[PDB]
C-alpha cells in the first residue's frame, strides 16, 4: 500500500525508461 | 490438472483477504509455534485453528516451512473429537502445498499416515518405493477411511502415484532394454484395478458400522 511520485518531473536521471543507445554508451564509457 | 486448475482465479477474494488480513505484520505464527500447539497434551483445537486459519492466507511459496509440521502432526487429527474445521483447513493447506511441491509432500504424507501400531518400525517410504508400489498409500491408518479430508488427501496421492508408477515402469523398461511391453501393460492394468477394488472395499460398511 504505497504510491510513487517524482520530485522533478523533467529530471533526465530517472531510469523509468532505458533506451538502447544510452545503454551501450553507458556500458561503453562507465568506469 | 486438478493440481493446476485450483491456482486459477475465481473472483479475487483470496487476494483481497490476503491484502486486508495479512498486512498486520503479526508474523508470530511460526511452524515451531504450530508444532507446540499440536504437541500440547491437553490439546486445544481452538488454538490450533487460530494458527492454521491464518495460514490459509499464505501463498504456496511461503507455506513451505509449515509442511513438515502440519503433515507429521496430522496423525493426531485421526483421533476422536477432532473438529471438522481443523481437518478441512488441513486439507486446504495440503492442496496449497500440493500445488507447489507435490512429490516431497506426498512422501511425507505417506510416511505420516502410517498405522503406527508397531511404530518403532517407522517404515520410512521413499519416492522410489511408492512409485514401485502405489498401493502403499492405501495401507494407512484405518481411521483415514472414515476421515473425508484425509481420505481426500490419500486419494490425491493414490492418483498421483498410479500415474508416477506408469511413468516409472516405462522408464525402467527403457533402461533395462539394453513381450516386455505386454507385461508392463498387464502390470499397470492389474495395479489400477487393484486400486479400484481396494477403494470399493473401503466404500463398504464395516461390521461395526453394520451393527
Amino acid at each position: 500500500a504505497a504510491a510513487d511520485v517524482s520530485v522533478w518531473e523533467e529530471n533526465w536521471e530517472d531510469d523509468i525508461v532505458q533506451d538502447d543507445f544510452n545503454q551501450q554508451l553507458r556500458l561503453e564509457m562507465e568506469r | 490438472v486438478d493440481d493446476w486448475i485450483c491456482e486459477e482465479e475465481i473472483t479475487g477474494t483470496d487476494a483481497l483477504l490476503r491484502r486486508m488480513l495479512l498486512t498486520n505484520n503479526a508474523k508470530n505464527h511460526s511452524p515451531k509455534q504450530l508444532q507446540e500447539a499440536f504437541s500440547a497434551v491437553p490439546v486445544n483445537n481452538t488454538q490450533v485453528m487460530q494458527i492454521i486459519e491464518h495460514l490459509t492466507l499464505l501463498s504456496a511459496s511461503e507455506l513451505i516451512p509449515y509442511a513438515e509440521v502440519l503433515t507429521s502432526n496430522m496423525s493426531q487429527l485421526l483421533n476422536s473429537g477432532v473438529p471438522r474445521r481443523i481437518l478441512q483447513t488441513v486439507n486446504k493447506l495440503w492442496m496449497v502445498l500440493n500445488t507447489v511441491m507435490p512429490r516431497r509432500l506426498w512422501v511425507m504424507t505417506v510416511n505420516a499416515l502410517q498405522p503406527s501400531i508397531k511404530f518403532v518400525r517407522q517404515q520410512k517410504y521413499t519416492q522410489n518405493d511408492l512409485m514401485i508400489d502405489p498401493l502403499i498409500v492405501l495401507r494407512c491408518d484405518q481411521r483415514v477411511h472414515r476421515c473425508p479430508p484425509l481420505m481426500d488427501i490419500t486419494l490425491h496421492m493414490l492418483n498421483g502415484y498410479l500415474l508416477a508408477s506408469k511413468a516409472y515402469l516405462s522408464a525402467h523398461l527403457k533402461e533395462t532394454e539394453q513381450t516386455r511391453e505386454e507385461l508392463k501393460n498387464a502390470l499397470l492394468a492389474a495395479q489400477d484395478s487393484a486400486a479400484v477394488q481396494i477403494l470399493l472395499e473401503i466404500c463398504l460398511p464395516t461390521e461395526e458400522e453394520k451393527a
Binding site: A1, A2, D4, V5, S6, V7, W8, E9, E10, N11, W12, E13, I16, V17, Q18, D19, D20, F21, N22, Q24, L25, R26, E28, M29, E30, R31 | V1, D2, W4, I5, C6, E8, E9, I10, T11, G12, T13, L16, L17, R19, M20, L21, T23, N24
Partner: protein
C-alpha cells in the same frame, strides 16, 4: 515469415506426444506478439481450438493459459462461430475437469461472445453442479459474462442471490459468489436490487471475511453505478467509525481511497468532516495513516474546494504534520500544502508558515535515515515543497534557504533528492539561482574530493543545479567543475551526463570541454562520431556567444564560424547514424539549425545589400524602386516561411518527444515566423500589417529560462517592428537595422538541446501490413485493405496516447496524386484495419503510397507512421482490348 512459423508450431501440435503439443501451445503467444495480424491469429486460434476439442485435459489447460495471456488478440479472431462451437463442444463431456476448463475458456472469451445463449445456459447449469471445480469455473465464467452482457447479469442475479443466501452453500463458496454482484450495474433497478442484497449480506453475515468481501463488492458496485456512491461513502464511514475490527476499518480505508480516487467530486462536506473526526479520535497509528492517505488524496482534488476557517481538517493536518510517525507527518504536510496552494482564501494564511516549517522539519527527519520508507517520505516532502514554491512564490526564498542549509548535513541519497527539488524550483523561478550558487559550489567541491560510488549521481545532480541556477555563463565555477572532473573522475558516464545538462542549459563551452575529454574513452566508432558531433555543436554554439549588440560584421563572422563547426558536426552526426539508431530527430534538428543560421547570414548580407545602390532606370518610377534588395527581401521572407514550415514538420514528426523538446521546436519555429513577419511588415507589405501585437498570454508562465529569453526577444522585436511600421519608406536603413538587431537578439540567447536530442523514451511505430509489381485490370478498380498495429517500447503512453489513425492514400503515375482519400480509424487493441478503393482508369504504371498519421487524444495530428509505397501495373483487360481493336479495325 508468419505462416512458416505457424506451420512450425502446427507440426508440433500434430505430433501426438503430449510434451511437444504442450510446448507448441505455450509457444503460441510469442507468435501473436511477432505477428499480431488477424490472419495468423485467426488460423492459430482455430487450430488451438481444434486441439482443445480433441486434446486431453492438460492440453486444454495449456490452451486456457494461452487464451488468458492473449485476451487482446481475440478480438481479431473474426471466425468466431466455428472457433467457439468447437470450443463449446467440450461442455458436454462427462468429465467435470474438462467442463471446468471449458467454462474457464468461455469466461476468458466472454468479450467476443456476449449474449451467446448456449454459453449462458451452460454457466447456469454448471452453477448448481455437484463438482466443486465445475462450480468454481462457473462462478468465474459468470463473473466475466456478467461484466460483459447485461442479459446474463439480469438472468443470473436471482440465482446468485439464492445460492448466497441458501443455507446449503458453504461459507467459502459464499465468499466466491459475492463479487458477482459488482457486475449488476447495467440497470438502475438491477443495481438497487444488488445494493439491497449486499446490505442484507453485511447485516446477516457479519464475519470478517464475509463483511470484507461484501463491503468491497458494494464499493465496486457503487463506483460502477455512481448513484448510490454518496450513501456508499456514508456506509463506509459508518463501518470505519463503528466497527471495532482493524481489518474492517482497513478495508473501509482502502475503499474510501478508491472512491476518493474515482469520484472525489461526490464527497460532501459532512463526509470529509466524519473522516476527519475518525482520524482525530482513533488511537491506532496504522488506521490514522490510512485515513490521512485518503484525506491527502482528497485534498489534491476539487473536494477541498467543496469542503470550504479553522475546521477539523486543518486541525487534523496541523496535528498530523508534527507526528512521530514519518508517514503520518508526510500525509499531514501534504494536506497542508494542498490547502495552501489550492485555497488563496486569506482566512487560512496562518498555516502557510506551518506548512513551510513542517516541510523543513520533515527534511530534518528524513535526511539522515537513508531508508526506503524515509526516502519515500522525503520524496513526498520535496514534491510538496516544489508545489508550494510554484503556488506561493513569495515562500520560494525560505524553501530554497531550508534546502541549502539542509544540503550540508544530509546523506547522499537525500542530497540527490534535494538537488532534484532545487533544480525544479530554479527551473521555474530562476531569480533564486544566484542565491544558491555559493552553497552548491561549496558542496560540489567537498563531494568531488571523496566521490567513490554513490557520489556519481550526486555529482551529476549538483552539476545540474549549478547549470540550472546559473542564469548567465560560468567563469570560476566552470574552472572548479572542470578541475573536479579531471582530478579524479575516470567515470566517463558522469562526465557525459554533466555535459548533457550543460548543453541543455546552454553552457556550451563547458559541454565542448567535457565532450572533447570524452573522446578516446569510447570503443565504438559510431559513438565516437556521436560525441565528436556533440563537441562540434557545442563549439558552434559557443562561437556565436560573442555577438555585439550592433556590430553586424562581427555577427557575420561569428555566424560563419558557427556554420563551419555546425557543418563539421553534422558530417560527424551522419557518420554516427546507424540502423536501429538512425538519430533522425537529431539530424533534422541540427539541419534546421544550420538553416536559419545561413538564412540569418543571407539576411545580414541583405542588410548590407542596401549599400549597393539601386539602378537609375528603375529609380524613375513603389517597392521596385528599392532595386535588388526588394526581391532579396522577398526571397528571405519565403525562405523563413519555408523554415517555419519545416520546423512544424519536425514538430509533428516528433510524436514520441517529451513536452519540453516540442516547446523548444515551437520556439525555433516562432523565431522563424518572427523574422518572416518583420521582413513582411517592414519591407513588403506595411499597409497590411494587421492588428497590433496584443499578447493574449501577457505574462506567460514559462517552464524554462530559455523560454523566458525567447519570449522576451520576441516581444522586444515585435515592439520594435510596431513602432517602425509606416514611419519610413522600405529603402530605410532603420528597417535593416531592426532586422539585423532582431538577428542579434535571437542569436545571443544560447541554444538548448532538449531531452529527445539525447534520450528516446516512447518509441511508438506502425507496422502497416497491406494486401498486395501487381497487375490490375483497367475496368476492375483495386480493392486495397491496409491493416496496422501500433507498436510500443516499455510504457506505451508516456507522453501521449494514440486516439485515432489517419490513413492517407495517394497514387502517382509514371514512377501525380490522382487517388487522394483519407480514413480516420480508431485502433481498438492497438490494431486498425480498413478497406480502400483505388481507381485506375488511366492505363500505365501507378505508385500507390499510404502514409499513416496519428491523431492524439487532444486532437493534434502527428505524422508518425511509415509512408510505405507499392507499385501497381494497370493494364487494359484482354476482353476490352480485343473488342476495341475489332471495332476500330
Amino acid at each position: 515469415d508468419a505462416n512458416s512459423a505457424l506451420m512450425e508450431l502446427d507440426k508440433g501440435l500434430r505430433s501426438g506426444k503430449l510434451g511437444e503439443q504442450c510446448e507448441a501451445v505455450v509457444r503460441f503467444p510469442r507468435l501473436f506478439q511477432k505477428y499480431p495480424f488477424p490472419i495468423l491469429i485467426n488460423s492459430a486460434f482455430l487450430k488451438l481450438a481444434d486441439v482443445f476439442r480433441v486434446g486431453n485435459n492438460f492440453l486444454r489447460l495449456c490452451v486456457l493459459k494461452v487464451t488468458q495471456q492473449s485476451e487482446k488478440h481475440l478480438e481479431k479472431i473474426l471466425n468466431v462461430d466455428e472457433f467457439v462451437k468447437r470450443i463449446f463442444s467440450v461442455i458436454h463431456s462427462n468429465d467435470p475437469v474438462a467442463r471446468a476448463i471449458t467454462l474457464r475458456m468461455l469466461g476468458s472469451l466472454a468479450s467476443i461472445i456476449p449474449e451467446r445463449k448456449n454459453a449462458h445456459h451452460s454457466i447456469r447449469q454448471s452453477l448448481d453442479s455437484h463438482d466443486n471445480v465445475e462450480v468454481e469455473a462457473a462462478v468465474f465464467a459468470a463473473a466475466n459474462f456478467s461484466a460483459q452482457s447485461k442479459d446474463f447479469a439480469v438472468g443470473i442475479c436471482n440465482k446468485i442471490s439464492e445460492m448466497i443466501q441458501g443455507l446449503a452453500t458453504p461459507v467459502d463458496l459464499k465468499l466466491k459468489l459475492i463479487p458477482i454482484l459488482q457486475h449488476m450495474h447495467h440497470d438502475a433497478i438491477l443495481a438497487s436490487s444488488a445494493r439491497q442484497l449486499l446490505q442484507q449480506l453485511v447485516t446477516s453475515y457479519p464475519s470478517t471475511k464475509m463483511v470484507i468481501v461484501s463491503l468491497h463488492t458494494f464499493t465496486l458496485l457503487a463506483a460502477s453505478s455512481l448513484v448510490d456512491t454518496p450513501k456508499q461513502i456514508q456506509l463506509l464511514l459508518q463501518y470505519l467509525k463503528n466497527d471495532p475490527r482493524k481489518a474492517v476499518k482497513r478495508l473501509a480505508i482502502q475503499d474510501l481511497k478508491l472512491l476518493a480516487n474515482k469520484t472525489p467530486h461526490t464527497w460532501s462536506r459532512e463526509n470529509i468532516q466524519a473522516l476527519c473526526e475518525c482520524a482525530l479520535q482513533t488511537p491506532y497509528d496504522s488506521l490514522k495513516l490510512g485515513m490521512l492517505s485518503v484525506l491527502s488524496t482528497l485534498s489534491g482534488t476539487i473536494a477541498i474546494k467543496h469542503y470550504f476557517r479553522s475546521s477539523d481538517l486543518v486541525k487534523l493536518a496541523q496535528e498530523c504534520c508534527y507526528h512521530n510517525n514519518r508517514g503520518i507527518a508526510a500525509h499531514g504536510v501534504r494536506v497542508l500544502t494542498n490547502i495552501t496552494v489550492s485555497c488563496q482564501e486569506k482566512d487560512l494564511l496562518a498555516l502557510e508558515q506551518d506548512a513551510v516549517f513542517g516541510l523543513e522539519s520533515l527534511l530534518v527527519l528524513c535526511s539522515q535515515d537513508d531508508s526506503p520508507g524515509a526516502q519515500a517520505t522525503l520524496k513526498i516532502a520535496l514534491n510538496c515543497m516544489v508545489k508550494l514554491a510554484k503556488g506561493r512564490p513569495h515562500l520560494s526564498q525560505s524553501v530554497v534557504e531550508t534546502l541549502l542549509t539542509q544540503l550540508h548535513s544530509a546523506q547522499d541519497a537525500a542530497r540527490i533528492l534535494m538537488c532534484h527539488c532545487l533544480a525544479a524550483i530554479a527551473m521555474q523561478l530562476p531569480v533564486l539561482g544566484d542565491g544558491m550558487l555559493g552553497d552548491l559550489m561549496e558542496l560540489y567541491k567537498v563531494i568531488g574530493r571523496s566521490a567513490t560510488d554513490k557520489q556519481q549521481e550526486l555529482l551529476v545532480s549538483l552539476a545540474t543545479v549549478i547549470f540550472v541556477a546559473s542564469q548567465k555563463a560560468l567563469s570560476v565555477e566552470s574552472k572548479a567543475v572542470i578541475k573536479q572532473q579531471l582530478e579524479s573522475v575516470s567515470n566517463g558516464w558522469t562526465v557525459y551526463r554533466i555535459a548533457r545538462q550543460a548543453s541543455r542549459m546552454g553552457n556550451h563551452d563547458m559541454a565542448k570541454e567535457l565532450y572533447q575529454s570524452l573522446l578516446t574513452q569510447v570503443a565504438s566508432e559510431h559513438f565516437y562520431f556521436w560525441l565528436n558531433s556533440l563537441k562540434e555543436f557545442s563549439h558552434a554554439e559557443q562561437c556565436l556567444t560573442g555577438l555585439q549588440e550592433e556590430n553586424y560584421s562581427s555577427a557575420l563572422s561569428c555566424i560563419a564560424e558557427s556554420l563551419k563547426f555546425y557543418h563539421k558536426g553534422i558530417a560527424s552526426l551522419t557518420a554516427a547514424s546507424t540502423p536501429l539508431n538512425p538519430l533522425s530527430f537529431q539530424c533534422e534538428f541540427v539541419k534546421l539549425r544550420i538553416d536559419l543560421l545561413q538564412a540569418f547570414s543571407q539576411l545580414i548580407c541583405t542588410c548590407n545589400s542596401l549599400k549597393t545602390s539601386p539602378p537609375p532606370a528603375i529609380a524613375t518610377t513603389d517597392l521596385q524602386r528599392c532595386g535588388r534588395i526588394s526581391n532579396q527581401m522577398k526571397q528571405s521572407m519565403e525562405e523563413f516561411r519555408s523554415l517555419a514550415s519545416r520546423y512544424g514538420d519536425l514538430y509533428q514528426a516528433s510524436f514520441d518527444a517529451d513536452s519540453a523538446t516540442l516547446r523548444n521546436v515551437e520556439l525555433q519555429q516562432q523565431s522563424c515566423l518572427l523574422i518572416s513577419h518583420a521582413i513582411e511588415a517592414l519591407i513588403l507589405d506595411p499597409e497590411s500589417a494587421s492588428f497590433q501585437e496584443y499578447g493574449s498570454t501577457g505574462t506567460a508562465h514559462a517552464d524554462s529560462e530559455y523560454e523566458r529569453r525567447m519570449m522576451s526577444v520576441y516581444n522586444h522585436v515585435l515592439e520594435e517592428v510596431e513602432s517602425l511600421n509606416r514611419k519610413y519608406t522600405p529603402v530605410s536603413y532603420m528597417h535593416t537595422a531592426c532586422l539585423c538587431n532582431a538577428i542579434i537578439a535571437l542569436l545571443k540567447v544560447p541554444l538548448s538541446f532538449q531531452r529527445y536530442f539525447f534520450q528516446k523514451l516512447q518509441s511508438t511505430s506502425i507496422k502497416l501490413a497491406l494486401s498486395p509489381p501487381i497487375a490490375v485490370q483497367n475496368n476492375q478498380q483495386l480493392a486495397l485493405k491496409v491493416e496496422g498495429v501500433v507498436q510500443h517500447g516499455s510504457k506505451p503512453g508516456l507522453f501521449r496516447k494514440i486516439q485515432s489513425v489517419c490513413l492517407n492514400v495517394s497514387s502517382t503515375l509514371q514512377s501525380n496524386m490522382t487517388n487522394e482519400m483519407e480514413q480516420r480509424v480508431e485502433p481498438h487493441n492497438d490494431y486498425f484495419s480498413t478497406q480502400f478503393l483505388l481507381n485506375f482508369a488511366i492505363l500505365g504504371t501507378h505508385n500507390i503510397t499510404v502514409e499513416s498519421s496519428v491523431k492524439d487524444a487532444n486532437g493534434i495530428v502527428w505524422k508518425t507512421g511509415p509512408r510505405t509505397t507499392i507499385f501497381v501495373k494497370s493494364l487494359e483487360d484482354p476482353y476490352s482490348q480485343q473488342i476495341r481493336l475489332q471495332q476500330q479495325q
